[PDB]
């Protein structure tokens, strides 16, 4: 029951905000002590490569960005309740990692 934390990590913002909000309101209605979403610095993966395969042109470059948005929600609740509240909330395009102490 002690200090389970839940790390929600995704590339989409909307889906991550929706699922995390659902976990929070799902926990709040049960009268459980919850520490709110801790938004960490957004990880931006940059790749800059030549457009051309051959290498004859005006030396143009692509700029490929990949965004990683990470949220932490913390609970002071029993593991039995934590298991089912973590079980019910599934979404394609979010990764959830639960840790205790």
């Amino acid at each position: 029951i002690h200090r389970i934390r839940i790390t929600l990590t995704s590339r989409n913002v909307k889906s991550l905000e929706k699922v995390c909000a659902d976990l929070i309101r799902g926990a709040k209605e049960k009268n459980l002590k919850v520490k709110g979403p801790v938004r960490m610095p957004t990880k931006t993966l940059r790749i800059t490569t030549r457009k051309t395969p051959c290498g004859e042109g005006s030396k143009t470059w692509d700029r490929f960005q990949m965004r990683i948005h990470k949220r932490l929600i913390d609970l002071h609740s029993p593991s039995e309740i934590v298991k089912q509240i973590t079980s019910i909330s599934i979404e394609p395009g979010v990764e959830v990692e639960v840790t205790i102490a």
Binding site: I47, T49, R50, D62, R63, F64, Q65, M66
Partner: protein
């Protein structure tokens, strides 16, 4: 024989590495463990998750 076929060491160097797609060993993107040719990455960038913003 057995001790001269693939005898030369390839722990390091450009010859040791190769593209995961086309097995080419030139203009290779080995950042974030992509391990892929620059031509092949540009083809597979979209469905990997890499997007062009600015």
């Amino acid at each position: 024989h057995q001790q001269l076929y693939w005898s030369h060491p390839r722990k390091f160097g450009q010859g040791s590495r190769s593209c995961r797609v086309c097995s080419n060993r030139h203009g290779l993107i080995r950042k974030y463990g992509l391990n892929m040719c620059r031509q092949c990455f540009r083809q597979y960038a979209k469905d990997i998750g890499f997007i062009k913003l600015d």
